[PDB]
Amino acid sequence: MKKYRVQPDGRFELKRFDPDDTSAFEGGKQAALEALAVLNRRLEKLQELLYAEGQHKVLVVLQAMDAGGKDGTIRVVFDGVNPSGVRVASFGVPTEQELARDYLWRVHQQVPRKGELVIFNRSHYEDVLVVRVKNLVPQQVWQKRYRHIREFERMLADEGTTILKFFLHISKDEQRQRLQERLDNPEKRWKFRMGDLEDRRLWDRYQEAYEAAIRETSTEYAPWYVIPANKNWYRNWLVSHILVETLEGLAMQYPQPE
Amino acid sequence: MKKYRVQPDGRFELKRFDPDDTSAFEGGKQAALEALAVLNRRLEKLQELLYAEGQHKVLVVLQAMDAGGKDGTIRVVFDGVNPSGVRVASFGVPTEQELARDYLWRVHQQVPRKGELVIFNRSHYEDVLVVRVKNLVPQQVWQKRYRHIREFERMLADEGTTILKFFLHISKDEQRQRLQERLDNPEKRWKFRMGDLEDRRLWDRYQEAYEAAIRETSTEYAPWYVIPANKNWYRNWLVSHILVETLEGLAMQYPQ
Amino acid sequence: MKKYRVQPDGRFELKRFDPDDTSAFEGGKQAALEALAVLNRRLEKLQELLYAEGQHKVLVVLQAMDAGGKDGTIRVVFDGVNPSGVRVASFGVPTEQELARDYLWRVHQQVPRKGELVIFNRSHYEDVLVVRVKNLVPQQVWQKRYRHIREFERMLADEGTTILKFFLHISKDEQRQRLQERLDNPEKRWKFRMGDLEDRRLWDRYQEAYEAAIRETSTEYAPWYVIPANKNWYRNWLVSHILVETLEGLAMQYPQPE
Amino acid sequence: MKKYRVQPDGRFELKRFDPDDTSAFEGGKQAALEALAVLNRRLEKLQELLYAEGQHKVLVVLQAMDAGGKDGTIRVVFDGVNPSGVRVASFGVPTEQELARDYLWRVHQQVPRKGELVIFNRSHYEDVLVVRVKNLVPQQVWQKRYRHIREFERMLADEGTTILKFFLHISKDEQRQRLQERLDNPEKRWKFRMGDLEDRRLWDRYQEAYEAAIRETSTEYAPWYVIPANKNWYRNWLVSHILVETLEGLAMQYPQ
Ligand SMILES: Nc1ncnc2c1ncn2[C@@H]1O[C@H](COP(=O)(O)O)[C@@H](O)[C@H]1O
Ligand SMILES: Nc1ncnc2c1ncn2[C@@H]1O[C@H](COP(=O)(O)O)[C@@H](O)[C@H]1O
Ligand SMILES: Nc1ncnc2c1ncn2[C@@H]1O[C@H](COP(=O)(O)O)[C@@H](O)[C@H]1O
Ligand SMILES: Nc1ncnc2c1ncn2[C@@H]1O[C@H](COP(=O)(O)O)[C@@H](O)[C@H]1O
Ligand SMILES: [Mg+2]
């Protein structure tokens, strides 16, 4: 928990994190599935409590390289969690409507309301990742955006939002295996685009981008967690453990009316 | 199971439906939970197909009296179904912005997009239900709304939306038990409001409102299903069966 | 003046309307400008009353061929009218987010609120115009849309919206002059899109589409008005006259609080 | 005029500003109306150019006490300006849907898009004004909001928004005259509410709230302008002048 939490010291180095690391769990895959089922049951109960109390706002931000485990995390971690209090907001290629306003406009629109848990499948961070790597704006523009994000997230947290930002960390070789597996799976072949290859060629620039973004935006109010995502079982257990510990820390109570 | 589908003949009578009816399931609770688990697995797969194909739009409308089982249906029927392709839109007391436009404005906003399944926890029907009962607009205004709804739903269906409307039918005595159980449960005591007593006094007017709404709006394109909701196990199984049968009927295919 | 209102008889013929017709005004450009200034002053007062009363909703729909006078009508007719109670909603090429829902979704979003006057620069009608002409959906799909529109407009009118639908009617030769004038004007060439020429080639199909749309959707609750728009002075006077007469007919009253 | 622009030094004192001040104009009412007509013609042309170029975003924020001249400024300054590129976003009593998210959510939603000029009739500043005065949230919560505003406005400006914030400054006696004139005018009586009288009972607290807000949020990127609004002719001329000078400074060009 404390080991994977990026301290707000601005001394973060992504090389200090191994995507194949599983040191926080002992028993291996079979034991982790059992432990995950226990955390998932607790998560279902915690969400019902969040919805009932209707005061806190929970924002889960998911960021990863293509095939890093974004969709898998949503699927497995939030499995069985009530759709009435859980919402997924995906952020893709901005439209002309979205580009006509500031980059935060489309994002701020999707923020969770009181008693709601919202998952961001990609986020406002894409405006300091893809736009940096592909040079969609000059440094003089995207460099100022780290301060914007820190301050947008401070405002959200001050106004009652609990912000959990997860970087699902995979290796270059793991991305290759997963992209090939997606291509060879007939039920997953539809997810693949030609543009995914150009992001594979820019792997190093994207790693430099994530390191810069995490170093700049992991705060006390909105912390970043580096999740070793090479082994899905560990990724699913660790994301669930961190989320459950956070929600348990809010000390939420059922309202008692008159 | 088509015995629960309200025919578009305008001859619908709610008295012909018993909330304690379980005749479509040959067995009880334990057998129904097993049957529901099979239907839920099929539902998970059909939504996966819906999202992937990305062509059809699925709208599930839930309407019931307070404690009728709307929250329970969402929880149990859509348990395990991917949150990326499933969305819940709740319709409560209209805001000033909402009331400043036509009653369909806030509802049309929330319609499902291609490859999305949207559940309406209460809907545009509230504008011919609570609105009628409490006379929030005169008889002259809300009577014209039946035609508006039929025509809004025709447009949605013609444009590619599969509309399933479920009326979760509970009895007056079942509501009394559930409202008391809600009050005596500390984890459910929050759902209880003082205004729930006034709505209990208006039970008969609300039943008259539902009968009128269902009779007027059950169409070939947007059918109404009366679900006997006194037994949660039966309610959950029947809603899942009707939903799975409908989605299987769309003959959805994974893109090439 | 009731000669331009299309009766809900389904017997409408666009050939019975001459774009160069000026028979409702006993004079020319100079007298019409004076008459328009009187109507514009009345319109300014009528809008202040609409906003104050805060009950009625006013929807002005503008439809015309490219360079038919939609922007000019907004500019001249609503000149001096308070921006607090007047809004323009433009409908262009639908986005992917817009095409993912029914064609009425993006249009219903922009409907006027109580005490507001909204102008639709192009509208839901485009889904039976450019959609019909270029076969963006099959005949089996867009033919059902006349009933959808009639019923959407009935719901709006029943719920308190006053619907004025204006077809700004220009000749094929007038469009040629205006498109050329647009191209030769440096302050107006930004408006000229290359596709305008392709829409000009399809002139006859578009006239057939407008005749069909007007014949099908001109109702007692939402009437269509064919405005001879070849002479801008007449177009501006006639639209202002019809709008002022309609708003005067609402017999709006200033609220009288306790 | 640079004399009315609040320097980002945090040393702003509202007592240094006289609502009856007219020192930037030497001619008087009749001469100012003529000068305003010239500026309004320039404003009409500059908006047509903003819309055509479709790159810049213009945000005009209006803040004043009740009857301070917010509606009058919109009416007179933007008179004849094309409605296609001009939008008014009013911020009133927050709805339940609005209060369920952060106070900036409803505000950020209304920001101008490329080629659009948006006027905020009241704004996000209300969340450090009526919220401060009436203690709708505790001091601990609204004190943090000045930093939020500065940073929200920095982000907007960095992303291409030209932010003009105008405080229409009226005296306590001028408000009394205007509220009475509103009450005695049959065509303006509707604008009067019983709650307007409490905002007069709390005049001093509101002045302390405006001084705090202006001192905390007047920046190089989003400046505050204190407009002596006791004389409408001067208010309309000065707001017009500042706006026209700003828009002329954008050096906007017609696309090729
Ligand atoms: N702000 C943005 N600017 C540019 N590209 C973006 C932005 N947000 C998301 N994207 C990209 O849009 C794509 C969406 O892909 P997906 O939603 O996974 O199908 C990803 O490759 C993102 O990197
Ligand atoms: N159109 C409407 N007009 C009036 N009340 C409504 C409308 N739609 C929903 N409601 C009511 O809003 C309430 C929502 O309560 P809840 O289920 O606790 O969120 C119920 O009492 C509904 O009947
Ligand atoms: N429903 C629609 N389907 C297709 N094209 C449309 C639709 N609505 C508007 N358009 C077109 O979008 C364009 C907008 O151009 P403009 O007037 O320059 O903004 C016109 O060519 C319209 O015909
Ligand atoms: N954030 C806010 N919190 C509370 N009241 C507000 C807020 N924003 C605006 N208001 C008030 O809403 C009212 C709107 O008045 P009106 O001009 O009649 O529409 C004013 O009294 C404002 O002070
Ligand atoms: Mg106000």
Side-chain angles (χ1 to χ4, degrees), chain C residues 236-256:
Chain C
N236 298 330
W237 172 83
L238 192 61
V239 170
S240 299
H241 173 84
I242 291 155
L243 179 57
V244 163
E245 238 209 42
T246 311
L247 284 164
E248 285 282 4
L250 293 172
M252 298 178 284
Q253 300 269 324
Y254 278 105
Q256 302 299 326

Side-chain angles (χ1 to χ4, degrees), chain C residues 91-94 106 122 126-127 130-131 136 199:
Chain C
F91 296 101
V93 171
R106 65 159 192 174
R122 291 184 189 275
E126 286 293 329
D127 291 287
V130 55
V131 174
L136 305 175
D199 291 329

Side-chain angles (χ1 to χ4, degrees), chain B residues 145-176:
Chain B
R145 297 184 173 178
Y146 291 128
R147 192 205 175 104
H148 301 165
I149 293 161
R150 281 197 298 271
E151 299 301 330
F152 167 59
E153 290 176 354
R154 185 197 301 272
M155 182 276 302
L156 291 182
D158 279 344
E159 289 309 312
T161 304
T162 305
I163 305 158
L164 289 106
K165 300 172 298 178
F166 299 104
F167 171 61
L168 308 167
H169 188 43
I170 54 144
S171 62
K172 197 180 162 77
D173 190 62
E174 187 65 40
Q175 199 193 47
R176 191 205 54 77

Side-chain angles (χ1 to χ4, degrees), chain C residues 95-109:
Chain C
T95 62
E96 199 276 282
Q97 177 238 48
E98 280 165 0
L99 289 167
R101 285 105 175 153
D102 63 274
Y103 68 97
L104 281 175
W105 181 81
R106 65 159 192 174
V107 198
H108 197 174
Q109 224 141 52

